Amino acid sequence: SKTITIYLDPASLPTLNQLMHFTKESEDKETARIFGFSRLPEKITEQYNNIHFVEIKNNRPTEDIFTILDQYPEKLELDLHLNIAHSIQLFHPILQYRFKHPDRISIKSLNLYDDGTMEYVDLEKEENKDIKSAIKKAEKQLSDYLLTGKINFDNPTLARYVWQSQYPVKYHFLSTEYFEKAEFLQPLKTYLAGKYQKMDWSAYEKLSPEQQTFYLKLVGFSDETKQLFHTEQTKFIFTGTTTWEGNTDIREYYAKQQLNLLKHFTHSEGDLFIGDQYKIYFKGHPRGGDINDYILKHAKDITNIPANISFEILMMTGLLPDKVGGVASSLYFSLPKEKISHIIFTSNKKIKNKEDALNDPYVRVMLRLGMIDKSQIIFWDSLKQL
Fold first, then answer.
1. Distances in whole angstroms, Cα of residue 39 to Cα of each of 97, 228, 308
2. Sheet containing 377-379: order of strands
3. H/E run at residue 357
4. Given 207, 223, 248, which residue is the final one in a domain?
5. Are residues 193 and 221 both part of a single domain?
6. Of 19, 26, 224, 228, which one has the greatest count of Cβ atoms within 10 A?
7. What residue numbers bound the domain in which 113 lies?
């Protein structure tokens, strides 16, 4: 028996958690790892004698994974690490490989991690259905999947949660409170009991100094960059965006409005003044380009955070700021209640006003769980020019 640790994610949040798990396990240079990510440092990988990379394509590992495993001719135990929402597809080629060598390969255990809000939005869609029987149904259908390869599930979204019926499993959730307080999911909470933890932004503080550097290197968090967060000053971060349906294609208009929005937080005459307590940071959109240049250019005593550092990374390094606010985005679902200030919704095809904003799926759930109240949702129109 050789154990093979296999990490798979097409998004980014699983990937960060799986990398943390690698970091925890990093003393171990011998065990074999397969990294299937959509988004790793040579000074690190060269330390490991059995390390492989595989492309992800249509939320699965490509058949290259067969070639990689083909290299290990012993009996194998596979430790899998999966994106929860895409778990069934990510699992499939592994299952396909097991069928090819049924005596020699087994699945030792799963770790499953939230893509993001997607899971919650998807579960929110099942509020009317009978959860208790759908779980018994998925269990059956899942057993058929592991025997046959056939993917037929009456409730695909619930199917993602019944893996304990087949394997030792460990879930990592963005919001445990959702399962705990959503009434319709009673039978599921109970069924999952004991097998799930909240995504820890506390694991990075638990690491040794040597492992902390190791993790920072892994995720691309430069030392220079880390510096900007080295100050006992409390910190507020403004969440940028690109454009929206503001009645023009001129990118500098959008930039000028976000500069206006930002001032509503930073300037004392603004409606959302946060106070002189906080050091100001800008976390513009990755796709932002000249919008971001334009805002960085015109805003004063503001520290920029680059595209490579995302909110996810900040949280995994225990570097959440004391407040967050600005343009609305699904990242707000991840923030603790007490870190949120005010959220601004720009007009797009779904959302033309505040009533629509309060109807967005991830928003309903945050309101229902008291992560925010309605005073904190603001429609971009209501704010005046300064």
1. 24, 24, 11
2. 303-304, 279-283, 235-239, 323-327, 340-345, 377-379
3. helix 354-359
4. 207
5. no
6. 19
7. 1-207
